[PDB]
């Protein structure tokens, strides 16, 4: 259920499934991988 395609719809209709383009044979027991990494920083000169 968690292996469904994820995309932003510029074109809503998919001529080929993203999984099909990925060529996987995903099963229920296959651990799908997701990792989000975000960094944010605001810089103030210590030279006052």
């Amino acid at each position: 259920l968690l292996d469904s395609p994820i995309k932003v719809p510029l074109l809503l209709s998919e001529p080929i499934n993203i999984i099909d383009a990925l060529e996987m044979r995903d099963a229920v027991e296959k651990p799908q991988e997701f990792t989000i990494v975000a960094f944010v920083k605001y810089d103030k000169n210590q030279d006052v």
Binding site: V8, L10, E14, I18, A21
Partner: protein, 337 residues
């Protein structure tokens, strides 16, 4: 004081159409003596669609210059669409603008042997000044396509001439269009100087193989203060095809101080080819003549309407004179049974 804002967003997957390549940049500059410069450029690239924009505004006090272009282009197997716009605006003492717009497409659907193409240039040049207007544009475009249900080709040419200076208005319209089946020229001219006169002139010439020809010409000269009106109204229509005949309309008059005369003349000889080889014989004489004076007047109206085998003449004529009063009614009509 300046700010640099740059963006690079890249969302990637398969199905390249689904892959976009976005970039946006913004740069601002502002010294204490206030000449301001601003610039922008935004880019996205996905196989399905690509549109590009760049705008750079400058402000040197009284002087302001605006440049901004945007061009989009669609690319698919059946068709490739192309739209481009460039805008140049500058304001120092007058407000003059130009905005050019090129459109293009080339659509081809070989499933039914269909090909369509149209290139349109839509450009505006405009100048604004206190006491003067200079506006004009050219609606230039052409077309072509061959489809079993529909096939056409021709060129369209429209020019719009407008201008203002002092208390006189100048406006010139002239449309010239050509097509395989329809050919027509439409010139229109108008001018009126303050509260002095009014010049109206019409030039319509329509060309049609199936219908025949039709000519409309008419001209107007009105002078104010003295209350004179003198417009010339004429027209000739040749009818060909299912309806064959001639329609002529002469419209004459002269409105003058204490004198007004109207001459209307509508004539038509029409033979309409109905289904089952039945012809309607329409022949009518509608003729009018009027005169008006403070002391005497007259009105005459005469109709001679005839359909197929039924003919009808209706006669009426009234004349006001101190010597004699005219009052007669002439009614005559025959209907074969």
């Amino acid at each position: 004081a300046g700010i640099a804002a740059s963006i690079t967003a890249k969302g990637e997957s398969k199905l390249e159409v689904l892959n976009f390549d976005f970039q946006a940049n913004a740069q601002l500059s502002n010294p204490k003596i206030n000449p301001l410069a601003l610039k922008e450029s935004v880019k996205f690239s996905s196989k399905y669609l690509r549109t590009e924009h760049g705008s750079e505004m400058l402000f040197f006090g009284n002087a302001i210059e605006g440049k901004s272009n945007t061009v989009a282009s669609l690319h698919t197997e059946k068709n490739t669409l192309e739209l481009s716009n460039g805008v140049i605006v500058k304001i120092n003492n007058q407000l003059t603008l130009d905005s050019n717009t090129k459109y293009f497409h080339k659509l081809n659907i070989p499933k039914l042997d269909f090909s369509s193409q149209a290139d349109l240039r839509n450009e505006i040049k405009t100048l604004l000044k206190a006491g003067h207007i200079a506006w004009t544009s050219s609606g230039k475009g052409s077309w072509k396509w061959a489809c079993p249900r529909f096939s056409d080709e021709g060129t369209h040419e429209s020019q719009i001439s407008f201008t203002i200076e002092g208390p006189l208005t100048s406006f010139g319209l002239s449309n010239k269009i050509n097509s395989k089946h329809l050919r027509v020229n439409q010139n229109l001219v108008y001018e009126s100087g303050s509260l002095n006169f009014s010049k109206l002139e019409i030039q319509s010439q329509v060309d049609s193989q199936h219908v025949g020809h039709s000519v409309l010409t008419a001209k107007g000269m009105a002078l104010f203060g003295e209350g004179k009106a003198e417009f010339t109204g004429r027209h000739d229509a040749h009818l060909n095809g299912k309806v064959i005949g001639t329609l002529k309309n002469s419209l004459f008059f002269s409105a003058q101080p204490f004198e007004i005369t109207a001459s209307t003349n509508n004539e038509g000889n029409l033979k309409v080819r109905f289904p089952l080889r039945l012809t309607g014989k329409i022949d009518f004489l509608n003729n009018y003549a009027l005169f008006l004076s403070p002391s005497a007047q007259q009105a005459s109206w005469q109709v001679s309407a005839r359909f197929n085998q039924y003919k009808y003449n209706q006669n009426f004529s009234a004349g006001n004179n101190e010597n004699i009063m005219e009052a007669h009614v002439g009614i005559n009509g025959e209907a074969n049974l």
